[PDB]
Design a protein around this motif. Structure first.
Motif, mmCIF file in Angstrom:
data_model
loop_
_atom_site.group_PDB
_atom_site.id
_atom_site.type_symbol
_atom_site.label_atom_id
_atom_site.label_comp_id
_atom_site.label_asym_id
_atom_site.label_seq_id
_atom_site.Cartn_x
_atom_site.Cartn_y
_atom_site.Cartn_z
ATOM 1 N N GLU A 6 27.472 -4.265 -0.043
ATOM 2 C CA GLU A 6 28.105 -3.808 -1.276
ATOM 3 C C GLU A 6 27.064 -3.412 -2.315
ATOM 4 O O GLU A 6 27.216 -2.394 -3.001
ATOM 5 C CB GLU A 6 29.023 -4.899 -1.827
ATOM 6 N N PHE A 9 25.581 -0.079 -1.314
ATOM 7 C CA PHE A 9 26.522 1.004 -1.579
ATOM 8 C C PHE A 9 26.583 1.324 -3.067
ATOM 9 O O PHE A 9 26.610 2.498 -3.457
ATOM 10 C CB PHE A 9 27.909 0.632 -1.055
ATOM 11 N N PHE A 10 26.607 0.293 -3.915
ATOM 12 C CA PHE A 10 26.629 0.523 -5.355
ATOM 13 C C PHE A 10 25.361 1.228 -5.818
ATOM 14 O O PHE A 10 25.416 2.140 -6.652
ATOM 15 C CB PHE A 10 26.805 -0.803 -6.094
ATOM 16 N N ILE A 13 25.572 4.857 -4.786
ATOM 17 C CA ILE A 13 26.511 5.587 -5.634
ATOM 18 C C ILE A 13 25.887 5.875 -6.993
ATOM 19 O O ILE A 13 26.019 6.980 -7.533
ATOM 20 C CB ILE A 13 27.827 4.800 -5.773
ATOM 21 N N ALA A 16 23.322 8.641 -6.614
ATOM 22 C CA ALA A 16 23.978 9.934 -6.447
ATOM 23 C C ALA A 16 24.532 10.442 -7.770
ATOM 24 O O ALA A 16 24.410 11.631 -8.088
ATOM 25 C CB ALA A 16 25.091 9.826 -5.405
ATOM 26 N N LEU A 17 25.150 9.557 -8.555
ATOM 27 C CA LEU A 17 25.674 9.964 -9.855
ATOM 28 C C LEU A 17 24.551 10.415 -10.781
ATOM 29 O O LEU A 17 24.690 11.413 -11.499
ATOM 30 C CB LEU A 17 26.460 8.815 -10.486
ATOM 31 N N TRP A 37 31.172 15.903 -9.498
ATOM 32 C CA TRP A 37 30.573 14.802 -10.246
ATOM 33 C C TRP A 37 31.632 13.800 -10.691
ATOM 34 O O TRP A 37 31.400 12.586 -10.653
ATOM 35 C CB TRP A 37 29.795 15.345 -11.447
ATOM 36 C CG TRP A 37 30.617 15.515 -12.690
ATOM 37 C CD1 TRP A 37 31.426 16.569 -12.999
ATOM 38 C CD2 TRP A 37 30.709 14.602 -13.791
ATOM 39 N NE1 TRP A 37 32.016 16.369 -14.224
ATOM 40 C CE2 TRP A 37 31.592 15.169 -14.731
ATOM 41 C CE3 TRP A 37 30.130 13.361 -14.073
ATOM 42 C CZ2 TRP A 37 31.911 14.538 -15.932
ATOM 43 C CZ3 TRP A 37 30.447 12.736 -15.266
ATOM 44 C CH2 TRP A 37 31.329 13.326 -16.180
ATOM 45 N N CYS A 40 32.622 11.724 -7.666
ATOM 46 C CA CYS A 40 31.553 10.791 -7.327
ATOM 47 C C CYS A 40 31.514 9.624 -8.304
ATOM 48 O O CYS A 40 31.347 8.468 -7.898
ATOM 49 C CB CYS A 40 30.209 11.520 -7.308
ATOM 50 N N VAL A 43 34.433 7.300 -7.542
ATOM 51 C CA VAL A 43 34.203 6.510 -6.335
ATOM 52 C C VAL A 43 33.193 5.403 -6.609
ATOM 53 O O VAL A 43 33.369 4.257 -6.174
ATOM 54 C CB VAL A 43 33.746 7.423 -5.182
ATOM 55 C CG1 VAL A 43 33.354 6.594 -3.965
ATOM 56 C CG2 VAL A 43 34.841 8.419 -4.827
ATOM 57 N N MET A 44 32.113 5.728 -7.325
ATOM 58 C CA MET A 44 31.110 4.719 -7.645
ATOM 59 C C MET A 44 31.705 3.611 -8.502
ATOM 60 O O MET A 44 31.430 2.427 -8.277
ATOM 61 C CB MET A 44 29.924 5.369 -8.359
ATOM 62 N N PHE A 47 33.888 1.377 -6.297
ATOM 63 C CA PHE A 47 33.143 0.541 -5.364
ATOM 64 C C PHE A 47 32.171 -0.420 -6.041
ATOM 65 O O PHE A 47 31.651 -1.316 -5.368
ATOM 66 C CB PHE A 47 32.376 1.422 -4.372
ATOM 67 C CG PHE A 47 33.213 1.904 -3.221
ATOM 68 C CD1 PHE A 47 33.593 1.034 -2.212
ATOM 69 C CD2 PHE A 47 33.625 3.224 -3.150
ATOM 70 C CE1 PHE A 47 34.364 1.473 -1.153
ATOM 71 C CE2 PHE A 47 34.397 3.668 -2.093
ATOM 72 C CZ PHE A 47 34.767 2.791 -1.094
ATOM 73 N N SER A 48 31.912 -0.267 -7.342
ATOM 74 C CA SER A 48 31.003 -1.155 -8.054
ATOM 75 C C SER A 48 31.685 -1.996 -9.125
ATOM 76 O O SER A 48 31.021 -2.840 -9.743
ATOM 77 C CB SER A 48 29.870 -0.343 -8.699
#
Length: 82
Positions: A6, A9-10, A13, A16-17, A37, A40, A43-44, A47-48
Motif C-alpha cells: 500500500e 502504491f501511494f 501515485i 505520477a501526480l 490528471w 490520476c 485514484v491516488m 488509494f492513499s
C-alpha cells in the motif's frame, strides 16, 4: 507485506501526480471526457486516504497521550471509536 504494498502504491501515485502537474504531456490525454490528471489524482486519493487517515489517527493518539488528560472513559471511547 500488505502495508508495504500500500505504501509503495501511494508513493507511485503521488509521483505520477507530481509528474503530471509538472509536465503538461500527461494533461494532453483525457479519458471519458475528463482530464487524465484529474483521474490520476482521484485514484491516488482513493488509494492513499486509508494511509492518510491512519497517520492522522496515530498523530492524534500521540498528542492525546502527551496531553494531561488521563480519564479512563475518554481513553476507552477513543480506542473504541478510532
Amino acid at each position: 507485506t500488505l502495508a508495504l504494498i500500500e505504501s509503495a502504491f501511494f508513493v507511485v501515485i503521488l509521483s505520477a501526480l507530481v509528474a503530471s502537474l509538472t509536465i503538461n504531456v500527461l494533461k494532453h490525454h483525457t479519458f471519458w471526457g475528463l482530464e487524465v490528471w484529474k483521474w490520476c489524482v482521484l485514484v491516488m486519493v482513493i488509494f492513499s486516504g486509508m494511509l492518510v487517515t491512519n497517520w492522522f489517527m496515530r498523530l492524534i493518539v500521540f498528542l492525546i497521550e502527551t496531553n494531561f488528560l488521563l480519564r479512563r472513559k475518554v481513553l476507552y471511547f477513543v480506542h473504541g471509536l478510532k
